[PDB]
Ligand code: HEM
């Protein structure tokens with residue numbers, strides 16, 4: 756279960772974050788890691804399509820090859836805090852699993868600038884029991900975390916040394932599909 760009420764960045768710039776470009780997860784902190792953690796790579800595009808906030812997600816497990824995409828409309832709870840009903844889609848946006856109540860994640864932007872971000876997310880999916888996840892994002896895949904985002908990790912009272920890096924995972928990313936999914 757999730758346990759954190761993450762605080763959104765003061766002065767969060769939504770238009771800059773939701774600009775249609777891609778964010779890569781470079782490091783993450785899972786508060787309830789499984790006994791045997793599945794080391795996935797992940798990226799997202801966040802944008803506005805016809806006035807609606809949207810996110811497209813990409814997950815890739817470089818060992819199992821499991822690969823899946825999602826698209827969500829985001830609903831606003833407050834500035835920088837969203838609730839997202841996801842639908843699983845193929846890379847082209849064709850629906851594989853429809854939106855359903857109880858399948859959603861919350862998403863809080865704790866820090867963001869031009870090139871980096873720190874987010875919190877809580878996933879709810881069926882009758883699964885999932886926990887909090889923090890993620891460091893960068894506009895450049897596998898970019899080393901800079902001082903601004905690392906300081907934000909500290910200011911959130913988290914220890915960056917506890918985060919798991921994706922940068923040495925032999926990750927590959929379908930960024931063109933992520934961008935085009937924003938309309939789907
Ligand atoms: C490296 C970072 C991440 C890892 C290691 C990771 C891992 C996973 C895993 C193992 C699952 C399968 C859950 C299950 O069904 O048992 C999953 C699903 C999911 N994750 Fe992540 N995740 C990451 C980042 C993110 C981010 C940043 C978001 C939201 C912005 C997100 C949203 C979701 C959603 C919505 C699903 C369910 C998709 C579906 O069933 O259609 N994940 N992730």
Ligand SMILES: N[C@@H](CCS)C(=O)O
Nearest residue numbers: 785878885886887888
């Ligand atoms: N909260 C998720 C992290 C990946 S989205 C989990 O419990 O595995």
